[PDB]
């Protein structure tokens, strides 16, 4: 499955609201 989110949560942050941080990458469950 193609991940909706893909922002690096290296700095403990996510751009897309709704995406959970899964260091070092944000992803939505």
Swiss-Prot record:
Disulfide bonds join 5-19, 9-21, 14-26. There is a cross-link at residues 1-29 (Cyclopeptide (Gly-Asn)). Leaves and stems. Lower in roots. It comes from the Eukaryota. Kalata-B1 is a cyclic peptide which occurs in three forms: with unmodified Trp-23, with Trp-23 oxidized to form oxindolylalanine and with Trp-23 oxidized to form N-formylkynurenine. Oxidation is enhanced by exposure to sunlight. The presence of a 'disulfide through disulfide knot' structurally defines this protein as a knottin. Probably participates in a plant defense mechanism. Has antibiotic activity. Has a diuretic effect. Has a uterotonic effect in humans. Active against the Gram-positive S.aureus with a minimum inhibition concentration of approximately 0.2 microM. Relatively ineffective against Gram-negative bacteria such as E.coli and P.aeruginosa. Inhibitory effect on the growth and development of larvae from H.punctigera. The unmodified form has hemolytic activity, the oxidized form lacks hemolytic activity. If the protein is linearized, hemolytic activity is lost. Belongs to the cyclotide family. Moebius subfamily. This is Kalata-B1. It comes from Oldenlandia affinis. The lineage of its organism: Eukaryota, Viridiplantae, Streptophyta, Embryophyta, Tracheophyta.
């Amino acid at each position: 499955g193609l991940p909706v989110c893909g922002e690096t949560c290296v700095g403990g942050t996510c751009n897309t609201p709704g995406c959970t941080c899964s260091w070092p990458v944000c992803t939505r469950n």
